[PDB]
Amino acid sequence: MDLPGELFEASTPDSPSHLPPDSWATLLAQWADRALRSGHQNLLSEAQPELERTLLTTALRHTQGHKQEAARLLGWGAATLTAKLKELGME
Amino acid sequence: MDLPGELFEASTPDSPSHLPPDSWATLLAQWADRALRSGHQNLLSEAQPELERTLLTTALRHTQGHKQEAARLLGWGAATLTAKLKELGME
Numbered sequence: 001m002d003l004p005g006e007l008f009e010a011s012t013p014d015s016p017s018h019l020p021p022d023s024w025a026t027l028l029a030q031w032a033d034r035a036l037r038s039g040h041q042n043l044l045s046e047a048q049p050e051l052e053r054t055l056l057t058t059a060l061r062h063t064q065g066h067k068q069e070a071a072r073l074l075g076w077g078a079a080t081l082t083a084k085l086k087e088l089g090m091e
Numbered sequence: 092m093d094l095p096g097e098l099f100e101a102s103t104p105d106s107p108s109h110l111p112p113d114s115w116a117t118l119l120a121q122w123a124d125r126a127l128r129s130g131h132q133n134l135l136s137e138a139q140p141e142l143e144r145t146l147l148t149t150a151l152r153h154t155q156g157h158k159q160e161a162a163r164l165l166g167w168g169a170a171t172l173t174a175k176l177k178e179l180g181m182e
Contacts, residue, residue: 021112021114023115025113026113028142029149032149033149036153040150040164043166044142044146044147044165047146048142055135062127075133075134
C-alpha cells in the first residue's frame, strides 16, 4: 500500500517543461553532413527560416502584436519584415 | 619533490580542444533580449551571417576549394553563392 495514488494521466497542470542546452549548431554541423552523405537538398533553406523565426518572434515579443515595431527592432522596415516572411516560404 | 616537472608553457602539441554543447539559440534568445533592453541594432544582421557561414563552410568541406560545388549542395547557384557572400557584408 502507498500514501500517494498511482496517478497515471496527462493533465494540463502538474506538467513542468525542461529547457536543456540545445546544441543547434552541433545539430546543424552533423545534420548537414549526414544529409550530404545521403540526399541533401534544402540544407540552408531549413535553418534559414529557423534563425529568422526565432529572432523575429523574440523582438516581436518586445512589441507583441505590433509586427511593425519589430521592423526598427531588427534594423528592418515594413517591406523587408513582410517580404522576408514569404522569402523563406518561397525560397 | 615530484616525478613530473612543473611544465608551465603553452606549446602547439599537448593542447586538446573541448567541444561542449553550444546553446546558440539559448544565447540568441537571451542576447536579443539583453540588447533590446539596452541598445539593439544589428540583431538579425549578426546571427544571419553566422548561420550562412557555418553551413557554407560545412557543405564546402564536402568540396573543399570547390566553392562552386557548394552551390548545388545548398540548392543554390553561382550568383547566389557569390551574391549571398556580400549580402551579409553589405546588409
